[PDB]
Structure 1
Amino acid sequence: LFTGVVPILIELDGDVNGHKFFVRGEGEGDATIGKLSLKFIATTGKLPVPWPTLVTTLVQAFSRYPDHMKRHDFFKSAMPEGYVQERTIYFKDDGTYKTRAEVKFEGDTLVNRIELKGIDFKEDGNILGHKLEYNFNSHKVYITADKQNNGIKANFTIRHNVEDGSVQLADHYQQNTPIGCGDLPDDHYLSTQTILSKDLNEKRDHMVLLEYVTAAGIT
C-alpha cells in the first residue's frame, strides 16, 4: 500500500485550558524513503499554543523500515483497516496533553483524525507564553510490542528549544491498537529529523513541515 507516494489528510480538534481550535493538514508521504511533507493551516485563527507542541500529534506508517527490519513494521501491518494512536504527553513543570487519533486509509489517501485535550498549563509558562523557538529537534522513538492489546507501545522525550537558551521537555506515552483483524515487533527505535518553515503567500496562521524518519535498533 506504501510502494510509492501516498496522499495525506489530517484533522485536529483541539482544546487547551478552554481555548478551542481546529487544524487541517494536507500533503504526501513516501515510506520507501521515509519522507513526509505537509502544510498545516489553523482554520480558527492564531493558535493558543506553539506549533512545535503539536508536531508529534500531527503518520508513523511512513517511517522507512529497511528490508532487514520489514517484519517489525506494525504501522503498515495494520493498513488499510488502520490503527488508533492514544498518547499522554507530560510537559515538565507545565501542563498535560491527552490525545486520541485514528489513522486509516480512505480511498487511496491516508487520513489522521485527532482529538486533543490540554489541562493544567501555566499562563506565562513556556507553552501559553509562546516562548518556544520555531524548531524541532531530532529524537529516537523507542518501540516495544504489546501482546495483550495486539499492538505496540512507545516512549520518548521531545526537547523543545526555548527562546531564552533553555530547553523544554515533553514526556510521551503512546499506545497503538489495530482497528481491524489480521506484526508485533522486537524492541527497536525510530530516529527522526524535522524542519519547520512558512509559506509567504499564506495569510493564515499555518506551518510547513518536512520530516525524515527511519527505523533502527536491530543489527
Structure 2
Amino acid sequence: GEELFTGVVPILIELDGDVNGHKFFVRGEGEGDATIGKLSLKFIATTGKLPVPWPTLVTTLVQAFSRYPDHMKRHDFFKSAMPEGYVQERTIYFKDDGTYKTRAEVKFCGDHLVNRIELKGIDFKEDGNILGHKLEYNFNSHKVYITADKQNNGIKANFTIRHNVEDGSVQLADHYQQNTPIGDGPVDLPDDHYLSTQTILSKDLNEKRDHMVLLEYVTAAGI
C-alpha cells in the first residue's frame, strides 16, 4: 500500500474530453514523490488547441502522492487502495456557467502509476470565462476537505477552486468528489481532514504543441 510510495514513482495521465461537443485528448507524464508531497508533470493536448483553458483541467489531471505526515498515516485512503487502485469521480460546477463530470481510474501498471480519465462538460456559455478563454494561466492554493464514506468503503471530498479571471474577477468551481477502491481487501477510512495544495503552472519555451507544465505540493493536515 504505502510501501509503493517510499520513492519516486513515474506517472502517465490520459484524459479523453468532450465539452459542449468539442472533443479533445490530453496526455501527461512525469513523476510523484509522496515522501515530500511533490508532483512534476508535463501535459500535451494531442488534438491541437484546447477548447477550454488549461487551469480548468488541473484538478482532474493523483492524490495518492499527497504527503501524509507520520501521525496521520492511518488516514491515507489513497495509498491504501494500491496497487489495484481507486475510481475517482467528480461533478464540478462552474458558478454562473457549465458543469464538468469526470470519472477516473487511478492504479499501478507495473512500476508506474496511471490516471485514466473521461470528462464530459455541458451547458457552458459561449463567451463565458471557460469557452471564452478568459482565465489566467495560474493556480491558487486550496484546502480539499475529506470525509469517510463507510457505505462505499471509500471517501468523499468537497472544495471550491478559485480561478483568476483576466479582468480581475474570480471564477469559482465547486467540486464534489467520490473515491471507491477497485480491488477487494481492506482500505483505510479516515477521520475528517484536509489536503492543503499549492500549484504552479508554466510553459516549456522549446515546446510548440499546446501544453502545460505543472509543479504541485500537497500535504495532509487537520488531525
TM-score range relative to shorter protein: over 0.9
State the Cα deviation string for residues 47-88 of structure 1 (Å, max 9, x = none). Answer: 000000000000000000000000000000000010000000
CA distance in 2 between counterparts of 1:135 and 1:196 reads 6
**Structure 1 residue matching 2:5: 3-state secondary structure:** coil
CA distance in 2 between counterparts of 1:97 and 1:109 reads 27
CA distance in 1 between counterparts of 2:16 and 2:53 reads 15
**Structure 2 residue matching 1:64: 3-state secondary structure:** coil
**Structure 2 residue matching 1:211: 3-state secondary structure:** strand
CA distance in 1 between counterparts of 2:208 and 2:35 reads 34
CA distance in 2 between counterparts of 1:116 and 1:5 reads 28
- CA shift, 1:181, in A, is 1.4
**Structure 1 residue matching 2:151: 3-state secondary structure:** coil
State the Cα deviation string for residues 115-154 of structure 1 (Å, max 9, x = none). Answer: 0000000000000000000010000000000000000000
CA distance in 2 between counterparts of 1:181 and 1:191 reads 29
CA distance in 2 between counterparts of 1:200 and 1:164 reads 26
CA distance in 2 between counterparts of 1:76 and 1:211 reads 18
Aligned to 1:103: 106
Gaps of 5+ in 2: none
State the Cα deviation string for residues 134-190 of structure 1 (Å, max 9, x = none). Answer: 010000000000000000000000000000010000000000000011200000000
CA distance in 1 between counterparts of 2:205 and 2:128 reads 29
CA distance in 1 between counterparts of 2:170 and 2:80 reads 36
Structure 1 stretches of at least 4 aligned residues deviating more than 3 Å after TM superposition: none
Query: What is the TM-score with the length of structure 2 in the denominator?
Result: 0.97
Aligned to 1:72: 75
State the Cα deviation string for residues 14-45 of structure 1 (Å, max 9, x = none). Answer: 00000000000000000000000000000000
Aligned to 1:190: 195
**Structure 2 residue matching 1:12: 3-state secondary structure:** strand
2:36 to 14, 27, 33: 33
**Structure 2 residue matching 1:148: 3-state secondary structure:** helix
Gaps of 5+ in 1: none
CA distance in 2 between counterparts of 1:126 and 1:203 reads 25
Query: What is the TM-score with the length of structure 1 in the denominator?
Result: 0.99
Aligned-residue identity in percent = 99
**Structure 2 residue matching 1:118: 3-state secondary structure:** strand
**Structure 1 residue matching 2:152: 3-state secondary structure:** coil
CA distance in 1 between counterparts of 2:152 and 2:168 reads 41
CA distance in 1 between counterparts of 2:18 and 2:84 reads 28
State the Cα deviation string for residues 72-105 of structure 1 (Å, max 9, x = none). Answer: 0000000001000000000000000000000000
